[PDB]
Amino acid sequence: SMGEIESYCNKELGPLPTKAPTLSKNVLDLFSLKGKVASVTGSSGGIGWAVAEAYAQAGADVAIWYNSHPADEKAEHLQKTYGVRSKAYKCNISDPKSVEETISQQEKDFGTIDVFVANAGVPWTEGPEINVDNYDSWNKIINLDLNGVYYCAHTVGKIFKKNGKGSLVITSSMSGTIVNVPQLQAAYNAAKAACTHLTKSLAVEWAPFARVNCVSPGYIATVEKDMKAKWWQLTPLGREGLAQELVGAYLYLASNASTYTTGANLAVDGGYTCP
Amino acid sequence: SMGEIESYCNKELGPLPTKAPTLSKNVLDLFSLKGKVASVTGSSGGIGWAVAEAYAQAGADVAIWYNSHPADEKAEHLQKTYGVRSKAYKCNISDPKSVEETISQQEKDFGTIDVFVANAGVPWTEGPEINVDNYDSWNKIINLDLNGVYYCAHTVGKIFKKNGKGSLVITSSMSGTIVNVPQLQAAYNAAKAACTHLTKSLAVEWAPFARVNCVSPGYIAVEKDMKAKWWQLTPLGREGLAQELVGAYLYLASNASTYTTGANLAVDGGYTCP
Amino acid sequence: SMGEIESYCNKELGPLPTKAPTLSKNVLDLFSLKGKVASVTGSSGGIGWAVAEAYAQAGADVAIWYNSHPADEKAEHLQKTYGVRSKAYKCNISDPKSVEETISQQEKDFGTIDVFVANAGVPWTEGPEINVDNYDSWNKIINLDLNGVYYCAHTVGKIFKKNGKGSLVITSSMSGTIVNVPQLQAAYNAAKAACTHLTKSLAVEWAPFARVNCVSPGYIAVEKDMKAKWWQLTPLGREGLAQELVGAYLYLASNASTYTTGANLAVDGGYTCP
Amino acid sequence: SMGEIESYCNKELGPLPTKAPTLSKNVLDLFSLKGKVASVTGSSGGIGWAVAEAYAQAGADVAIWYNSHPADEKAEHLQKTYGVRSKAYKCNISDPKSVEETISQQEKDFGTIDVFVANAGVPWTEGPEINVDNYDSWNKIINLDLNGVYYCAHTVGKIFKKNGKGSLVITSSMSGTIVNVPQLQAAYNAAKAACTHLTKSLAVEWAPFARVNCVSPGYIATVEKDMKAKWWQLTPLGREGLAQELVGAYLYLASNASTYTTGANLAVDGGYTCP
């Protein structure tokens, strides 16, 4: 190692400095996903479907994931409307083994995976933890909202490493930064904070071959009146967000617009984390 | 409902504002634990034993936890030296059922639990996760360093609510705030970040009856050249000692911190600042 | 008052909930700045010129600011190459009165201001503050890197409120989140942290009519061995380029981020994670 | 430098590792300030007076600071009640020169300064900044709540460096971490965030000879009804704090209880930063 500056972070970067990529000089071209393959978990639901069609509008082939609501006709919609390749995949993400089979199948079907969005999740709906006596709801949150994200990350990182390139986007939540009120959600808040800092941890470990980032959305239209009303009162923009207001953040992170961005948390929460 | 200011955080608080506690006018007496019962998990280990003995020095009865290394001699030493009640308990904290049995037996042996430190944990020692085929290592750390902490918290919070008083201290890590280098520890970093935010979430939920805070230690005193890089990145230029943590745990456990809840206390030699 | 949900953050918002904006259904059109006027301070410099040209490429009219290095040729180049309106303005932003004169003249020359980037700044280059007898260096950085940013913000916020629309982007620094080493930069770090929190404070105050976000760049490409340590501590292993920032500034300036306010966007190669 | 591990943070630490101090083995003795000299700015007001008498109860000599409310009889109270040496000092902290004269006078009067609390400050009381047209209130906040803290820090650090030991405690605010509502306070929020991160910056620079930390209190009893009521609703403990609830944090940081703690922000806010 004499005559080499080795990294304190990850010596697999090789002799420092690493060199910068080549980038289109037109900013609008940086956001293109033409020729890239995207994989979006939870793209049966509101947020995931939104980023999936946003990625298709950017020119990416898109693998769609579902569990209990088959979304083949969504994949058909992307092919019919944007001319891109798409397909739907069924997978219980709580199961590490199904996740690995699905991602391997996608690699074969599309040839590679350039972008991965780990987005599928479930909420905690049971009020304060102290009145919830068995640990099954806690475990169900940890299993999918944290362990499931890691199974997807661990599996696709080996694809990114083999090819030397990739962008992983994790859907976290403002619940990883703050505590939601009045609906108390300790298990979900803890899983999401794990997700945000797993993002930073994987950004360091994957540095030689991929970028890892995360979006922390606020309340997204996607509920008792008096509760929503307190949400609106505590959010500086004064309203809930729309799923279409998130896709710009996911496309920014997925594309060459963010080649120096890794380990970042993009809060898209109407300012809720500020007060 | 009408004629009452209701909390937006937690309606169990009752009509606002809540009542300030009665505190001694001498700052030194605020740190006393006389008449209080403390339970410290992982107190057969370095940090947990230092905290357990410090609580005994502050006057607390101390319940000692161990798993593989029996700590009954540690319990006798607190009894012999400080004249407090102490007993050691064997428990695998990754087992929920076993956690609930131990805490309940402790309530009966001491009468109550006033201070709880969720401290037992294991590190990640396999390097970059991308080369660990099997998920047992990931799951071993989540179950003990996250699920295990929740098992103790859920269980002792019931005691705190029954008595209307209590202080939970969670041992997190600077690994919950930063990413350690060059030893890559993704699973551990993630579990400790969940611990830190679990601290804040439970502070809100438990606020009518208990405080919840956490301590995030840095490196507390295995290849030379790796430490060398730790020292180079630590503003104070050295690793910490177990005795440099006990003031933090005593502050959070005692009446010195009655307005402090949901806080993360960094004791890391400044490592999180660069 | 009765029959209206009033905000706890800012009653200027009116009865809640507020109305979502109308957005294009194609994600790519959300990033367009066609029909919008952008003002970028410090746009004779590296980062600011890259952002100014990117906004022109997105279709915006661009007002260019300079102090000591005239940038009229930069304004002609945006006009010549992208067919947008552009003019360069001379201003010492540490002078409040001079800031207000420039922004007002810009409103008249372009009709309005839709996007503002507060970007001009100077670094600290004297090493450890303990050896700097005189306070002019501390004051020089506070006045330009903090007070100057506020002078522009206070002034352009009036335009945004009059028009009911606008996006302010503040150039902060990873120095607002961490402490740079080994070059010790206390005054600069403090001013950038104030900038980052000024971003959040103004997002709340301006929420009825404008968004306020900030970008925190890392090292963007002076002794070899110091960079060497920068590279060793940066997860990506290299310094950034100015072109790797423009996507962040375009995202925050455009309709792509209509639910994003008070956010700090780190573009630092991961430096804030270790 | 061959044969020496030099710090990446501050090479004035000398060859690494630095060694740990010697510490009493009884935790209660770590909190003692016997034989130490403390200097507390803003100790005419609520918070500063509280930590001053707490420091005196710990056995420290205490220099008391005032500007418009002479507090000599407070210094007399500390001497008469605790047998400690105390004195009052008049100083406009916005003026860098008066600050340096006062601290030099205290060094001569007491012999040294072991602990410094930079606590004096003023609030912003003028609502949203956009309706405040001259910059004088902004400047008055920056001048005292940020520049004044630095003048005190810069001056006492040279005392700490000369003697190789010291503890600086800065009174920040939860306003350095969050945005206060409904009373809008941009200038104060910005000054306080500067204070919190100046703490971290000085912790790195002063590492070879002092520790630097900061306390961020919430709302402390020390105001229109409807406004306070919204504060109470947003604070998890459900009430404002008392000044006596802060002194434990200041004594922890000032004493040998925290010899491995530097660059830390201790939030004492009833949990307000969590929701």
Ligand SMILES: NC(=O)C1=CN([C@@H]2O[C@H](COP(=O)(O)OP(=O)(O)OC[C@H]3O[C@@H](n4cnc5c(N)ncnc54)[C@H](OP(=O)(O)O)[C@@H]3O)[C@@H](O)[C@H]2O)C=CC1
């Ligand atoms: N404050 C908050 O609560 C915040 C929430 N989020 C998070 O954003 C993510 C997406 O949320 P959103 O689209 O709005 O919610 P939706 O319920 O609308 O969609 C959830 C998706 O997860 C999928 N999924 C559910 N369970 C499983 C399972 N075992 N295995 C595999 N996939 C599963 C569902 O698929 P299917 O329907 O086919 O079963 C669905 O596509 C979530 O992770 C959410 O937690 C982010 C912002 C803030």
Ligand SMILES: NC(=O)C1=CN([C@@H]2O[C@H](COP(=O)(O)OP(=O)(O)OC[C@H]3O[C@@H](n4cnc5c(N)ncnc54)[C@H](OP(=O)(O)O)[C@@H]3O)[C@@H](O)[C@H]2O)C=CC1
């Ligand atoms: N030392 C350091 O540098 C750092 C430590 N920490 C954390 O502080 C805590 C203790 O650390 P430390 O004292 O240094 O390490 P030690 O190994 O010395 O102590 C570990 C303790 O955890 C107990 N324990 C381990 N596994 C289990 C299990 N299944 N069930 C119940 N108890 C178990 C051990 O009990 P037994 O030995 O009897 O089996 C032991 O008492 C941990 O949370 C650690 O992650 C955080 C930051 C830095």
Ligand SMILES: NC(=O)C1=CN([C@@H]2O[C@H](COP(=O)(O)OP(=O)(O)OC[C@H]3O[C@@H](n4cnc5c(N)ncnc54)[C@H](OP(=O)(O)O)[C@@H]3O)[C@@H](O)[C@H]2O)C=CC1
């Ligand atoms: N490059 C980096 O690594 C980092 C930069 N930043 C910040 O990004 C901003 C610009 O940085 P960068 O482009 O790299 O440096 P440059 O020196 O290249 O650009 C500085 C710009 O600020 C302008 N300016 C300087 N002083 C004044 C003044 N009194 N009044 C008005 N304008 C003034 C300069 O104008 P002129 O030349 O005409 O006098 C110039 O356009 C700054 O806020 C910087 O602190 C943040 C993190 C890292």
Ligand SMILES: NC(=O)C1=CN([C@@H]2O[C@H](COP(=O)(O)OP(=O)(O)OC[C@H]3O[C@@H](n4cnc5c(N)ncnc54)[C@H](OP(=O)(O)O)[C@@H]3O)[C@@H](O)[C@H]2O)C=CC1
């Ligand atoms: N959310 C919030 O707003 C928070 C506020 N804080 C901060 O805690 C600190 C102390 O607050 P607190 O005691 O409660 O307020 P007080 O008004 O009661 O006391 C303020 C003290 O500052 C001194 N002082 C005022 N102006 C000057 C000046 N030019 N020069 C020198 N000294 C001056 C005053 O001295 P004299 O009376 O003799 O003129 C007084 O002793 C403050 O910095 C406050 O900003 C911390 C927690 C949260």
